[PDB]
């Protein structure tokens, strides 16, 4: 069955005139509004077209049109009748081009059999996203947007709300899995998250939905969700979610579309929905041509009577009808009659621009135009088309060219699903996107403020430097604020690093390098009365030796310790620079001689009070000698001391933060306990040597006061170290009461040795 | 048109170049009698055996569609339309179960790309183009012949068995060139090959772009192979060219060149080493007997037979029977020299594959007979070609020809296996003639000994010789891949393979030159020259400080010297006795301690000098007080001078890049004492001095002698201060000697100060 009519320029053409009826009979019931409707307009733009004197004036197009029956095997063999008319060999036709196919895989198979033989083709309803490489299809053409230009539109649309966590749901088929494939290049491609990605393909029952429903719902962060769905594959989705009570804000694609058997029954559930529609107008002179057709003088269309017989279930052979036409109640133009129109314009202008430039002498088909090139045809006036679209609405924007893909341009109108009414729900345009979004945010329902905006993010708000951004293992893309340590300074979004040791992190904590500084770690507030008494001490110990000095008239010169007072005078000037040097800032070297001026000072003290026991067992060089030789005793066990405690700093014992370093030195505790311990046991002994003495007076007007004083200086000195040791941490206390402790040992142990001086000076 | 057509129950389809390619006038030609003619009657004659035979399609009898593609690939796509004009079900037509593909790539393309849409299976017999194994186009085509990167796979594995890495590659123009340089290119870089130079010959040139390649080529000395993968014309012009100049190189080259003896006319000179691979093949006994018993009276079924015999003998046949010659049965190809075409295996082997698909699925689809039945009817050539087409295995036809790979199987893109052969040019008495020295079926099996070794002496095709990083480093000029070395500094390592890395001062690159190890540390005296010069000296010291104690300790009974000067004699016994230790201390291992001592026995040298010349000063016991109190003060202030100077010691880092050997030496401490010693050296000079010019002897505590030894002791330390005043700065070295020489200084001035001193204690006594 064909409607082919002879003319010089014949366009061939493929319509899915009868539905496909399975099995049975290979196509089943006639397509009242995708196979007759498209090819009725096919017609009405070939006869304008020949009426019109500005478009191939003097040659006139032809038609040879065949019904695919909405299948593939069926278009190919078909497009086979095309093929063989320009072979080398009823009457077959030259074709110079077709304008056919409705369905992908229709024209998919049309524009294989046809690329072989340089036939161009001209689609007005296929969306397929893998028709636009040239290396298989290189002589195929659109009039309509691809099905990834609804994708970038609706990216572009989640750009500008600034939702970056959306769910996203897919179909099985191409159509569905191909536009999600598109969403995660686009979303990659402008840094947008995917919380889940499921697939909801047809013959699933209720329960695949409801799981479907409730694997979005168990995600309270992502309030949006992108719909990749069929008409039939977003009906139970919308139904699963409205009878389980779910809400959140579609953004739907040219599957929803503004049709209503979607929101049937679900109303509540499709609440705030934006959806993508294709952008189409109505044709008023294609209206009023399809309103007078009658099948007694349509004698053209061979499927007419059919199509009258099926719609109006009427009979030619019982004369059921008799006066019946199609008015404006049961006829409603397709959204696709434009592009068809288009198409076939398109075409026409491509054959008249060819016309133009190969033979402009005169207004008809020359001889060099009789065989068609269709390989030249579409790379130079295919491609290059710039025209308006004829019965336009006067618009600017409505102009038809084809890409370098051989594409249609992406112009589609956005939808909302409006409640701001009385009673009624309905859509809206409420923008449209040609190559940039135009949205009107006024309407908006949910969408935009004053109705309760819904917002698409991961997590909480970007962390500051002052918290660790953690990734979570359920959602990687954003990050979680938890508090660090207030030590750690954040080097990177991993986590806090370590400001140092004893560092204190910086305000941006990125570079901190802030060791805290305690130069002064003993204040001068406290720092008096001990220097005070230090230098009550060496005065006093200045006055004792110039009163010896000037004592030599004395008889108690060479028989008396002069040498002894002395000894014991530069023992007490030691230990009181030892405790002054100590109670200042320490060193490197401060800490080492520290411990050795208070050894050296305890010998000589120790050694002074050994003179008694040397007198009590019996020459005055020898007392000098023992003297001499304790002292060297003590300076060897120092020495050893501190080579096995080798000076050094940076004694960070507390680890709070509030204060890492108290200056000190970097010897151990046990070292400082050592020496202390050596000390007592020194004095010690001399008390028991002391004590040992037999019964005589040697000089007992002083011998008495050295015995009562020296048992009290020894036990300070053994009390003073527990009081360290009782407080357990090292500080400018210990240090302080260690220091009187000393230069009040000191300043006794001179007082008593200078007691017979000054009872003699009375 | 002419057409094939056989009545059976089974109709296999058929294109062949039975006319060449269409000139300007006519869209055929003259009829190609080699390509054509001899693959359809191949493929008639396997039909013939399939029909007969036993075991292999017992009730199905075959038939064919023959039809002719005219060399062209639009004649072959209107031809085949034929193929799929029966399979509608919308000049009987006649079912095709399979259809046998055409020769030239791009008919099979064609072909391939309309049948894929109908369901129908293709094998090809000749078509070796790599965009047929593309599943995507062409799921429903397969070919018994192998693609053409398997040559370029080939190239590589010879390339890397002689290990040749910097080789040049020369293509043609069109797509077989491109296509073949690419997997070469490919299967190079896989397997570290350099490419040298990528030159082109295009399609058509005349005589000079040849010579500019040619020039090209040797513009790059280092790369003496050539790898060639180009056309059989072009090949023979290079050959002209190569010949023309005067170059020698050794061509690897590819099916183009093959045994070819077209190639090598000529120009028996360039080409004496040359390595070509040709497609595998073996003659099909029958076929020739087949061929050689056909005449144009009893072989009316091929229709093409009349006009190929009329034109092969150059005779007229019966339409005129006087025109130029008569085609009489004295004329025959038996009688005739007949050569078998490489590629009637390969179609053979097509049918025979196609034929054991249909048998296979005859077995299982139709059993308990052995008869086409209803569920046969129809031919279903996705399932067919899916289940039976890609797993067949199955001996050759005629594999009596020994042979172990004679299995015919496809791989998953339907693709034969690749058999190639290995030739080489050689001389045996002068006759230049090919031999076969290998042959590529999964692995090379090449016969070095046949080869004769390629040319005199295996060829060199390497840039430079590998570089070990031990002793010197590589770098890149203007050669990405490969390297020329430059040497590396002992004193340097490579902390990469590219560059060489400097320890520095601190640490000495490892033998290995991996990386830094602690160089040795400065040289120790304990074990050098001197070893017991320290020993020595101190013995000396030693023996002198006791024998001034001796002198002390009998000086308490009857004085002779201790008259006032007893604090004098017994300081400068202790500054005799420190000397001595101070002496030791300089041979003591690198350490601030240490280096803090050997200072302060230079500040006790000082003191001693100083309590010296407060000896002379004398001339009771408060007055002896206070010229010690004096001297204890002024040793103070020297070791608050020395304590000043002594501030955050410092290792003393030495050996600078003036003297950058194996073993560094380095000082005790920091190098920046030299000006502490100096002005340390001079308080002891100027003490001396002033003793001497104090050294009046102008009054006798107790004798004249004591005052003259004392001046004749000022002599000697100024003596000792002035001689050794030059050697300060000349000897500035970590050498044993320049230390020794201060240590065996000072303790002669330690000696010679005391010596004089003990003299009037023993006259005395
Ligand atoms: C008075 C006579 C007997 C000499 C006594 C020996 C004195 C001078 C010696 C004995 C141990 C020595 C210390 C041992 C180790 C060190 C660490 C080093 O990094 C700096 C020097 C320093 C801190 C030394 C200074 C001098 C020292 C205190
Ligand atoms: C024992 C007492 C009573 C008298 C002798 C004091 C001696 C041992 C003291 C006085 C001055 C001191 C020096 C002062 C400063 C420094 C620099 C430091 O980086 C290492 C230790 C060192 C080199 C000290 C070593 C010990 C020292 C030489
Ligand atoms: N333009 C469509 C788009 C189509 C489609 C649209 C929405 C939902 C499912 C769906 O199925 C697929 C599958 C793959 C590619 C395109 C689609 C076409 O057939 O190509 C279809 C309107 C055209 C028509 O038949 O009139
Ligand atoms: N197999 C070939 C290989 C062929 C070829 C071989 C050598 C030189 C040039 C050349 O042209 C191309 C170009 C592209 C792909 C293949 C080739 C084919 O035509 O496919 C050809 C042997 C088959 C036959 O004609 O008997
Ligand atoms: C999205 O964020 C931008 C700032 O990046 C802001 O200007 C804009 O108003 C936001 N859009 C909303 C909230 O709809
Ligand atoms: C190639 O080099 C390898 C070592 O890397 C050597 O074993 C082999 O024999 C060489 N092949 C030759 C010289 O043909």
């Not at chain 1, 069929?230 to 739907?252: G, H, I, K, P």
């Not at chain 1, 107008?281 to 269309?301: C, G, K």
Request: neutral net charge; glycine residues 6%.
């Amino acid at each position: 069955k064909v409607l082919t009519l002879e003319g010089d320029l014949v366009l061939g053409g493929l319509f899915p005139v009868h539905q496909k009826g399975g099995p049975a009979e290979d196509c089943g019931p006639v397509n009242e509004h995708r196979g007759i409707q498209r090819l009725e307009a096919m017609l009405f733009a070939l006869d304008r077209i020949n009426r019109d004197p500005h478009l191939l004036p003097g040659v006139r197009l032809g038609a040879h049109i065949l019904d695919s029956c909405s299948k593939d095997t069926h278009a190919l063999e078909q497009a086979l009748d095309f093929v063989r008319a320009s072979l080398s060999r009823d009457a077959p036709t030259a074709i110079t081009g077709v304008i056919g196919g409705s369905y992908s895989d229709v024209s998919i198979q049309v524009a294989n059999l046809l690329r072989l033989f340089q036939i161009p083709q001209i689609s007005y309803a296929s969306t397929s996203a893998k028709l636009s490489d040239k290396s298989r299809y290189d002589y195929f053409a659109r009039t309509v947007p691809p099905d990834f230009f609804q994708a970038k539109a609706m990216a572009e649309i989640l750009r500008f709300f600034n939702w970056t966590y959306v769910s996203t749901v897919a179909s099985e088929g191409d159509y569905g899995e191909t536009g999600i494939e598109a969403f995660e290049l686009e979303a990659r491609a402008r840094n947008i998250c995917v919380a889940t990605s499921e697939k909801v393909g047809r013959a699933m029952s209720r329960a695949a939905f409801e799981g479907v429903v409730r694997a979005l719902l168990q995600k309270p962060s992502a309030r949006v969700a992108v719909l990749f769905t069929r008409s039939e594959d977003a009906r139970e989705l919308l139904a699963a979610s409205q009878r389980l009570n779910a809400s959140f804000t579609w953004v739907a694609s040219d599957g929803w579309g503004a049709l209503e058997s979607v929101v049937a029954g679900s109303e509540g559930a499709a609440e705030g929905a934006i959806t993508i529609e294709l952008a189409s107008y109505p044709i008023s002179d294609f209206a009023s041509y399809f309103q007078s057709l009658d099948p007694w003088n349509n004698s053209r269309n061979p499927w007419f009577r059919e199509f009258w017989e099926q719609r109006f279930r009427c009979s030619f052979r019982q004369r059921d009808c008799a006066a019946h036409s199609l008015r404006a109640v049961p006829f409603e133009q397709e959204s696709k009659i434009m592009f068809v129109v288009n198409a076939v314009y398109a075409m026409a202008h491509a054959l008249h621009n060819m016309h133009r430039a190969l033979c402009p002498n005169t207004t008809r088909l020359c001889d060099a135009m009789r065989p068609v090139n269709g390989r030249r045809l579409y790379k130079d006036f295919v491609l290059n088309v710039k025209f308006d679209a004829p019965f336009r609405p006067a618009d600017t924007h409505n102009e038809v060219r084809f890409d370098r893909f051989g594409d249609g341009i992406g112009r589609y109108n956005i939808f909302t699903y409006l409640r701001a009414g009385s009673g009624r729900y309905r859509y809206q345009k409420v923008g449209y996107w040609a190559e940039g979004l135009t949205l009107d945010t006024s309407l908006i329902p949910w969408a935009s403020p004053s109705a309760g905006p819904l917002p698409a993010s991961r997590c909480s708000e970007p962390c500051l430097q002052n918290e660790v951004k953690s990734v979570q293992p359920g959602e990687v893309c954003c990050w979680l604020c938890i508090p660090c340590q207030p030590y750690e300074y954040r080097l990177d979004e991993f986590t806090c690093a370590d400001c140092g040791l004893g560092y204190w992190p910086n305000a941006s904590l990125t570079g901190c390098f802030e060791l805290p500084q305690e130069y002064i770690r003993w204040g001068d507030a406290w720092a008096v009365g001990p220097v005070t008494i230090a230098c009550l001490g060496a005065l006093a110990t200045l006055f004792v030796l110039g009163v010896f000095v000037r004592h030599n008239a004395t008889p108690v010169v060479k028989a008396s310790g002069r040498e002894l007072c002395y000894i014991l005078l530069g023992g007490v000037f030691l230990c009181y620079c030892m405790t002054f040097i100590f109670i200042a800032k320490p060193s490197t070297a401060v800490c080492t001689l520290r411990r050795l001026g208070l050894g050296t000072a305890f010998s000589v003290c120790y050694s002074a009070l050994l003179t008694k026991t040397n007198r009590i067992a019996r020459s005055p060089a020898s007392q000098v000698a023992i003297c001499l030789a304790l002292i060297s005793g003590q300076l060897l066990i120092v020495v050893a001391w501190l080579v096995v405690e080798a000076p050094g700093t940076g004694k960070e014992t507390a680890p709070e933060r509030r204060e890492v370093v108290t200056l000190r030195c970097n010897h151990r505790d046990a070292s400082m306990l050592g020496s202390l311990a050596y000390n007592v046991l020194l004095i010690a002994l001399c008390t028991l040597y002391a004590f040992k003495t037999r019964k005589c007076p040697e000089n007992f007007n002083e011998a008495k006061f050295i015995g009562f004083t020296m048992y009290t200086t020894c036990i300070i000195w053994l009390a003073f170290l527990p009081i360290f040791y009782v407080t357990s941490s090292d500080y400018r206390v210990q240090t302080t009461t260690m220091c009187v402790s000393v230069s009040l040992s000191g300043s006794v142990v001179l007082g008593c040795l200078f007691a017979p001086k000054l009872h003699i000076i009375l | 048109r002419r057409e094939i057509k056989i009545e059976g129950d089974l109709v296999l389809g058929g294109l062949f170049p039975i006319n060449e390619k269409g000139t300007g006038t006519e869209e055929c030609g003259r009829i190609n009698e080699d390509r054509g003619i001899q693959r359809l009657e191949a493929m008639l004659f396997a039909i013939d055996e399939i029909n007969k035979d036993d075991y292999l399609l017992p009730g199905v009898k075959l038939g064919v569609h023959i039809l002719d593609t005219c060399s062209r690939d639009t004649y072959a796509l209107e031809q085949s339309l034929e193929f799929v004009r029966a399979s509608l079900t919308k000049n009987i037509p006649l079912l095709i179960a399979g259809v046998i593909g055409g020769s030239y790539s791009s008919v099979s393309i064609q072909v391939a790309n309309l049948l894929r849409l109908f369901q129908i299976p293709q094998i090809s017999y000749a078509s070796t183009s790599a965009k047929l194994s593309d599943k995507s186009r062409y799921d429903y085509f397969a070919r018994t012949v192998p693609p053409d990167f398997y040559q370029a796979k080939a190239m590589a594995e010879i390339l890397r068995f002689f290990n040749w890495t910097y080789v040049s590659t020369v293509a043609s123009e069109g797509d077989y060139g491109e296509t073949g340089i690419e997997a070469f290119e490919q299967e190079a870089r896989l397997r570290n090959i350099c490419i040298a130079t990528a030159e082109k010959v295009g399609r058509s040139n005349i005589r000079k772009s040849y010579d500019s390649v040619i020039r090209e080529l040797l513009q790059k000395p280092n790369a003496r192979v050539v790898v060639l993968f180009m056309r059989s014309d072009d090949s023979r012009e290079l050959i002209a060219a190569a010949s023309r100049a005067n170059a020698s190189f050794t061509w690897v080259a590819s099916d183009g060149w093959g045994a070819q003896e077209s190639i090598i006319k000529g120009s028996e000179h360039v080409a004496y080493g040359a390595i070509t691979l040709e497609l595998a093949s073996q003659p099909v006994r029958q076929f020739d007997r087949y061929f050689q018993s056909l005449n144009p009276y009893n072989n009316h079924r091929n229709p093409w037979f009349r006009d190929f015999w009329e034109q092969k003998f150059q005779c007229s046949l019966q339409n005129k029977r006087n025109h130029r010659r008569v085609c009489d049965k004295h004329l025959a190809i038996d009688s005739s020299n007949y050569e078998q075409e490489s590629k009637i295996m390969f179609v053979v082997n097509a049918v025979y594959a196609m034929a054991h698909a249909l048998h296979k699925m005859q077995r299982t689809l139709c059993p308990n007979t052995t008869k086409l039945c209803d569920a046969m009817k129809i031919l279903d050539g996705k399932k067919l070609y899916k289940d039976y087409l890609l797993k067949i295995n199955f001996t050759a036809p005629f594999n009596p020809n020994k042979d172990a790979d004679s299995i015919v199987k496809f791989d998953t893109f339907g693709d034969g296996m690749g058999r190639y052969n290995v030739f080489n040019f050689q001389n045996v008495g002068g006759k230049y003639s090919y031999l076969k020295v290998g042959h590529w079926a999964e692995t090379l099996s090449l016969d070095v000994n046949s080869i004769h070794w390629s040319r005199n002496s295996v060829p060199t095709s390497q840039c430079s010789d590998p570089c070990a990083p031990n002793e010197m480093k590589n770098m890149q000029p203007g050669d990405v891949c490969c390297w020329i070395c430059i040497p590396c500094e002992p004193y340097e390592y490579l902390a990469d393979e590219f560059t060489c890395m400097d320890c520095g001062s601190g640490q000495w690159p490892t033998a290995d030159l991996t990386g830094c190890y602690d160089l040795p540390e400065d040289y120790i005296r304990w074990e050098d020259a001197w070893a017991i010069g320290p020993v020595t000296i101190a013995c000396l010291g030693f023996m002198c400080t006791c024998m001034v104690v001796t002198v002390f300790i009998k000086h308490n009974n009857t004085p002779l010297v201790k008259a006032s000067g007893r604090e004098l004699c017994y300081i400068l016994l202790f500054g005799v006795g420190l000397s001595y230790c101070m002496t030791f201390f300089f041979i003591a291992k690198p350490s601030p301690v240490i280096c803090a001592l050997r200072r302060l026995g230079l500040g006790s040298s000082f003191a001693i000098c100083y309590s010296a010349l407060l000896t002379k000063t004398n001339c009771k016991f408060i007055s002896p007080s206070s010229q010690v109190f004096i001297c204890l003060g002024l040793i103070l202030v020297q070791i608050v001078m020395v304590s000043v100077w002594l501030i955050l010691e410092a290792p003393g880092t030495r050996r600078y890049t003036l003297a950058e050997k194996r073993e560094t030496v380095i000082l005790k401490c920091n190098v920046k004492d030299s000006s502490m010693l100096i002005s340390l050296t001079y308080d002891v000079i100027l003490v001396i001095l002033c003793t001497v010019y104090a050294f009046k002897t102008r009054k006798c505590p107790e004798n004249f002698n004591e005052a003259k030894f004392i001046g004749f002791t000022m002599y000697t330390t100024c003596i000792i201060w002035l001689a050794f005043l030059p050697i300060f700065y000349v000897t500035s070295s970590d050498y044993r000697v320049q230390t020794t020489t201060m240590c065996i200084s000072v303790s002669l001035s330690g000696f010679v100060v005391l010596g004089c001193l003990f003299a009037p204690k023993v006259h005395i006594i």
